[PDB]
Amino acid sequence: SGFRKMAFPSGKVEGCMVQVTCGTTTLNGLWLDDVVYCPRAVICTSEDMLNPNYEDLLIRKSNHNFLVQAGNVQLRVIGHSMQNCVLKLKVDTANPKTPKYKFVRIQPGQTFSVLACYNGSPSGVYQCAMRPNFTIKGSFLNGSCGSVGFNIDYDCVSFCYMHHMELPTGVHAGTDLEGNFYGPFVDRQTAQAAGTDTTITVNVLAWLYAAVINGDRWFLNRFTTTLNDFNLVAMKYNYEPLTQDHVDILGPLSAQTGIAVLDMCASLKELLQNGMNGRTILGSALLEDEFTPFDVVRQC
Amino acid sequence: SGFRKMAFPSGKVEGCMVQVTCGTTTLNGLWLDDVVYCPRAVICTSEDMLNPNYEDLLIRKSNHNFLVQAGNVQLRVIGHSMQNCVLKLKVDTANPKTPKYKFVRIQPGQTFSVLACYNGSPSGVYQCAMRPNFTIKGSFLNGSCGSVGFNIDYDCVSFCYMHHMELPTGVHAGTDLEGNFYGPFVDRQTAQAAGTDTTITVNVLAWLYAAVINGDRWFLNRFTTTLNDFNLVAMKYNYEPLTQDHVDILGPLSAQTGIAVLDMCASLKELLQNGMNGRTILGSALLEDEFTPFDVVRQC
Amino acid sequence: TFTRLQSL
Amino acid sequence: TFTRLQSL
């Protein structure tokens, strides 16, 4: 029993984290087999960052301009190239700690674990969702560039995020591991802003099922609603529309609790219209939307 | 920027987790040097659990009754003994992954990271506080017995908790690593209940400072209060009294933000008396008390 | 309601 | 307000 914001164990990723220095700029890299992956922003300096031309900056570099440190050992760079917004530094030593892994891009509404790192050194682990507006509400300080986000599927680490930058609202933006940004953001220090966000409805429903599984039942009611009358209420409160795919996803959880999805939707509608009136659900006074149906099943 | 419930990276602890089986009972153990530590409840069976006499049960065991599995490899048990509520199984192989470590007992109000494990296999990591009533609000299923809680201080893992059981309210109880329970609980399946809990005041203040550091300022006011008029309000809302030690602990955070501790206490008093009225602090609609002053400084 | 020693 | 590439 109980329900926590739970991250994947980070050991497999900690053994891949290195430090990358070019000039006076340092950040984190990910060392898998004989390649080190890092944000291409490592090749910029203070003045370059407003309007850098990265192809120009990289042509002016050679292998010996990149200092890669794996704990104590310096790694010898024997090739370099750019793929979208990440650099690939080929090194002369395959990482003996390389796990089985994949590079996967995630969808808004999906969750992942973040291993925050500074100077190649893992500092903390936490769980994040990709927001509908392709930002994440992370916790990141200067030096965290190149920290990675991931899921573990059995023995296999699916890397899905590399951290690049902080937006003015204090939310965070980054790329997948082939260097393609999530959302309409670029790796230069300009006046970019996140678009308007929405609440991830299927996730809020999943969390309500977790609450019931854990004995929190006060928000339940006898009513049911139709998928369309619900979706009509969802729009007014800035919630995403619910699809039949989502109802299907929630199937196992509705089976385990005996509460039809449209039954739980009627509870969500009432919570949205009347609030909680001083009560809590799974320790929170807000409707929580950063747990997927998969997260709930795995933990419960 | 940003503020998350952040755990320590778990790699150093993952390399110590093993499976311990005795009879038809299986749980997790912690393998450090040539010793495996686990809950003594491993030597009980279904009927033994109501009123077990553990000294009796252990005298009836020999080394060959304990099956220890470290991943693929079975470890040979060459000695066994009981210390309070934990068993020490001496094995013929020192763990090559043993980190530098300490066994420390923590105080109510202090936080730690939990590595939830099943059949010796790490499943997830999350951050917990020890509640004033010596329970923790964990997330634990059958098979999680023997999972451990810890902090990392630089390269050194300070183990502080081993999980034993779930109380009827769904909160959790366990021991330090010398097998001494936190709180007035025993390792037998009887009708034990947690005492009444309180809110950890110094932690709520620390979190309010984190909020200000992150640009959340709406709850601030021009007022100040005295330590005693605050402590008078704290009692009515089931908050712990604030000590001058606590004011001292909060010193650095008040210096970084320029907000005197007693100034921030005046904001807490108003939040307690009027609520938040539809607003949030660092993403929460509740006053959060599971971050210590140290947690805030480290993350901010 | 009884306590649960969460072995397997 | 400008974006911050959080290198060191």
Token pair of B156, please?
């050194």
Token pair of A93, please?
């030593």
Put simply, the chain B residues between 148 and 207 with a CB less than 8 A from any chain A CB are: 166, 170-172
Return the number of other C-beta atoms located less than 10 Å from residue B151's C-beta.
19
CB neighbour list of residue B123: distance below 8 Å, 6 or more residues apart:
A9, B116, B117
Q: How far apart are CA A133 and CA A183, in angstroms?
A: 7
Phi first, then psi: what are they for B23, rounded to 5°? 70, -130
Tell me which residue in B25, B141, B165 faces C3 most closely, judged by beta carbons. B165
DSSP letter string, A3-72: ----BPP-HHHHTTEEEEEETTEEEEEEEETTEEEEEGGGG--GGGGSS--HHHHHHT--GGG-EEEETT
Q: Tell me which DSSP letter residue A222 carries.
A: S
Token pair of B25, please?
């009972």
For D5, nearest residue in chain A (alpha carbons): A165
Q: Tell me which DSSP letter residue A199 carries.
A: B
Cα four-point dihedral sign B214, B219, B223, B224: negative
Burial classification of residue A294, based on how many CB atoms lie within 10 Å of its CB (0-12 exposed, 13-18 middle, 19 or more buried): middle
Phi first, then psi: what are they for A271, rounded to 5°? -60, -40
Task: State the helix-helix crossing angle for A201-213 and A261-274, rounded to 10 degrees.
Answer: 100
Q: How far apart are CA A11 and CA A122, in angstroms?
A: 10
Tell me which residue in B119, B141, B165 faces C5 most closely, judged by beta carbons. B165
Nearest partner of B34 among B94, B121, B86, judged by Cα: B94
Token pair of B148, please?
């451990």
Using alpha carbons, list the distances in angstroms from residue A262 to A205, A248, A265, B258. 10, 11, 5, 51
Q: Do C4 and B142 touch (CB under 8 A)?
A: yes
Helix (H, G, I), strand (E, B) or coil at B121: strand
Residue the block writes with tokens 């506080």: B129
Q: Tell me which DSSP letter residue A59 carries.
A: H
DSSP letter string, A139-188: ---TT-TT-EEEEESSSEEEEEEEEEEE-TTS-EEEE-TTSPBSSS--SS
Q: One-letter amino acid identity for A235?
A: M
Q: How far apart are CA A71 and CA A17, in angstroms?
A: 9
Phi first, then psi: what are they for C7, rounded to 5°? -75, 180
Q: How far apart are CA A141 and CA B296, in angstroms?
A: 13
Residue B162 pairs with which residues in a beta bridge? B148, B175
Token pair of A125, please?
């682990």
Q: How far apart are CA B78 and CA B89, in angstroms?
A: 8
Nearest partner of B175 among B126, B130, B140, judged by Cα: B130
Helix (H, G, I), strand (E, B) or coil at B114: strand
Return the number of other C-beta atoms located less than 10 Å from residue B197's C-beta.
16
Q: How far apart are CA B131 and CA B139, in angstroms?
A: 15
- Element (DSSP H or E) covering residue A210: helix A201-213
- Is B215 in the A-facing interface, judged by CB distances under 8 Å? yes
- Is A276 in the D-facing interface, judged by CB distances under 8 Å? no
Q: How far apart are the first and last CA of chain A?
A: 7
Number of H helices, E strands in chain A: 8, 13
Tell me which residue in C1, C3, C8 faces B142 most closely, judged by beta carbons. C8
Residue the block writes with tokens 């004995």: A215
Helix (H, G, I), strand (E, B) or coil at B30: strand
Q: How far apart are CA B225 and CA B240, in angstroms?
A: 17
CB neighbour list of residue B69: distance below 8 Å, 6 or more residues apart:
B18, B19, B21, B75, B120
Residue the block writes with tokens 């932690």: B203
Q: How far apart are CA A36 and CA B271, in angstroms?
A: 49
Q: Tell me which DSSP letter residue B268 carries.
A: H
Nearest partner of A214 among B238, B187, B28, B172, judged by Cα: B172
Q: Tell me which DSSP letter residue A84 carries.
A: T
Burial classification of residue A178, based on how many CB atoms lie within 10 Å of its CB (0-12 exposed, 13-18 middle, 19 or more buried): middle
Count of alpha carbons within 13 Å of B207, Cβ hemisphere only?
A: 23
Using alpha carbons, list the distances in angstroms from residue B4 to A176, B9, B109, B190, B300. 22, 14, 18, 37, 10
The technique is: X-ray
Q: How far apart are CA A5 and CA B128, in angstroms?
A: 10
Using alpha carbons, list the distances in angstroms from residue A55 to A85, A161, B44, D5. 11, 23, 67, 18
Q: Tell me which DSSP letter residue B46 carries.
A: G
Resolution of the entry in angstroms: 1.8
